[PDB]
């Protein structure tokens, strides 16, 4: 109901595992924007990286810290491209509804939050349709979007981010030594090349429409164990560390190092039913 | 104005769950020579879903076989999907990817979407999707819609997918992780050309990773049943 830096920091620290870069970027971006009564541009975040490693999870933490109900708040709107925008040829129908929905909800609530999940599966033309709402305009058809928040979730860049985490692991460095500039350099060929910089450029000034690119790293065995313990408690089970270790034996990659789980924390909790009635 | 049977009749609290357990047990006799973990994990996974009052996501299973087990794969996968509704005449939605590899991706995406949605809207509770490896790669993005762990279109259904491997035989002792690795490696080989990203309507490795994390909860190997390879699925 009332965002405080301390509460958001505690929620991220207590609950989001193995994402040191994302924690820090989100804490400072979200707190700065919501605490600013006069923002000049809607806060636009792009969360990108490995499947199953916390992008919807941390979207919920953000929403919960701003609004009672979290994703079930009346003022938080989730679009899932693969569910709501599945067929490329229906882009006009999606676009017309999406423009009406965004404009009507910001008209009613300046501090609306819109989350676009699976944006890497969303028609480029449908993304083009929301670009005016992301920009530095004071008014867009008579409505200000400067207090709104846009959160994009995607897998784009996941393999290149993993290449960095692998390099650091092979070199004997700490995961937490990875810096955003390491990620940016690995992605300079793809997510951050000129065509994509072009695509996301402001139409008003010499700036990107995406304020923060928030990378998500692949997870290690120790991270899976942390998550399994939380799920056991939430189900009311007595934790059994032998079952934690066995459930966390997923399929890992590369073939040599076997350091990261193929699917992050997804398809893990299914295995609890093999051990608990 | 209520009638009660004697406690001795043991009338099921959950008729669909009790019928599934009985029919799934009878399947073991029709399909000899399978991994014990296929029956154990398949029963526990589907039972959990049938017993859920408000399931959060559908039950998705992958069965896989080598070429020598191709008829058994088709037969077993159909019967497992049918057993999900053992308490009704209701039968599975049937879709087959065989021969579709060079069909127009958007066309196949629409076909799959409408066959699943219409069936689930009208009372069917399971689908069997044969030869998943043979769909146009982009079309398989529709399975995000059906298999997401939070926002699936239909949460109280089962989706039984099959993958036919390229090798001739699958070792009888193959374990769960090796079986899953085989399927994983075949789908990355079929559905991608490199690790380089593609545009929104096409498959690439990064998009395939999120599909895989939605459909590979349980990947189960299938061995040939000689009589089914010889005579077909006659029951």
């Amino acid at each position, epitope marked *: 109901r009332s965002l405080s830096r301390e509460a958001l920091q505690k929620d991220l620290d207590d609950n989001l595992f193995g994402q040191h870069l994302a924690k820090k970027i989100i804490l400072n971006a979200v707190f700065g924007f919501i605490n600013n009564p006069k923002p000049k541009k809607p806060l636009t975040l792009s969360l990108h990286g490995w499947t199953g490693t916390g992008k919807n999870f941390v979207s919920k933490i953000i929403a919960e810290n701003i609004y009672e109900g979290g994703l079930n708040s009346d003022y938080v*709107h*989730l*679009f899932v491209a693969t*569910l*709501h*925008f599945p*067929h*490329a*040829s*229906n*882009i*006009t*129908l*999606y676009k017309d*509804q*999406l423009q009406l*929905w965004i404009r009507g909800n910001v008209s009613a609530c300046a501090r609306s939050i819109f989350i676009f999940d699976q944006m890497d599966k969303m028609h480029a033309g449908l993304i083009d349709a929301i670009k005016p709402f992301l920009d530095y305009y004071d008014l867009v058809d008579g409505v200000s979007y400067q207090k709104a928040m846009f959160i994009f979730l995607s897998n784009a860049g996941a393999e290149r981010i993993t290449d960095v985490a692998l390099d650091f692991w092979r070199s004997g460095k700490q995961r937490e030594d990875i810096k955003l500039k390491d990620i940016e350099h690995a992605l300079s060929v793809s997510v951050f090349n000129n065509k994509n910089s072009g695509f996301w450029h402001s139409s008003l000034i010499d700036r990107n429409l995406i304020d923060y690119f928030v990378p998500f790293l692949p997870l290690e065995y120790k991270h899976l164990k942390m998550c399994i313990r939380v799920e056991m408690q939430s189900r009311g089970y007595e934790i059994d560390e032998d079952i934690v270790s066995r459930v966390a034996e997923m399929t890992f990659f590369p073939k040599e190092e076997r350091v990261f789980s193929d699917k992050g924390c997804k398809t893990v909790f299914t295995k609890l039913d093999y051990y608990y009635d | 104005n209520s009638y009660y049977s004697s406690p001795a009749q043991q009338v099921p609290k959950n008729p669909a769950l009790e019928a599934f357990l009985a029919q799934f047990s009878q399947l073991e006799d029709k399909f000899p020579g399978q991994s014990s973990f296929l029956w154990q994990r398949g029963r526990k996974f589907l039972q959990k879903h049938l017993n859920a009052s408000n399931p959060t996501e559908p039950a998705t299973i992958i069965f896989t076989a080598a070429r020598e087990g191709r008829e058994t794969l088709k037969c077993l996968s159909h019967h497992v999907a049918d057993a999900y509704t053992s308490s009704q005449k209701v039968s599975p939605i049937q879709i087959d990817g065989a021969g579709r590899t060079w069909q127009d991706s*958007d*066309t*196949v995406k*629409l*076909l799959v979407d*409408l*066959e699943l*949605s*219409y069936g689930f*809207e009208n009372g069917q509770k399971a689908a069997v999707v044969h030869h998943f490896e043979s769909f146009p790669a982009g079309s398989t993005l529709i399975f995000y819609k059906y298999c997401d762990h939070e926002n699936a*279109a*239909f949460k109280d259904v089962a989706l039984v997918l099959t993958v036919l491997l390229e090798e001739e035989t699958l070792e009888a002792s193959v374990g769960p992780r090796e079986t899953e690795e085989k399927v994983r490696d075949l789908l990355w080989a079929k559905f991608t050309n490199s690790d380089t990203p593609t545009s929104f309507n096409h498959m690439d490795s990064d998009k395939l990773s999120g599909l895989w994390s939605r459909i590979s909860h349980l990947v189960l190997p299938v061995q040939p049943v000689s009589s089914i390879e010889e005579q077909g699925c006659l029951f």
Partner: nanobody, 121 residues
């Protein structure tokens, strides 16, 4: 908005028929329009469908022979059926589907009353 089909009747094996459906309201908002058919003692089955942006799909049994088309400006959908055989005998229904872009999945469906198609051998 109501869907009303016309164009049914009897055809000789090898012959052709064109079904039409007029909607009494605008159809631009329908994600998908399509044709289903129901033969004696059988479940209703998809024959053909088309998105608002003109992407089509067909049941395996009619591929090549049938063509669906859609005119958002005339609020109409059509099914051209060529090379008919007795297996195509059925009541044909036009369908329209409307889906949300937010929230839990659902489909608002519209159906016509159906038109009989009978193919003589």
């Amino acid at each position: 908005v109501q869907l009303v089909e016309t164009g049914g009747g009897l055809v000789q094996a090898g012959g052709s028929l064109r079904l039409s459906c007029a909607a009494s309201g605008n159809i631009f908002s329908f994600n998908v329009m399509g044709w289903y058919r129901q033969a004696p003692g059988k479940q209703r089955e998809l024959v053909a469908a088309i998105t608002s942006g003109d992407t089509t799909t067909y049941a395996d049994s009619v591929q090549g022979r049938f063509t669906i088309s859609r005119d958002n400006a005339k609020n109409a959908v059509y099914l051209q059926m060529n090379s008919l055989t007795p297996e195509d005998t059925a009541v044909y229904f036009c369908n329209a589907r409307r889906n949300p872009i937010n929230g839990p999945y659902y489909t608002t469906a519209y159906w016509g009353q159906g038109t009989q198609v009978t193919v003589s051998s």
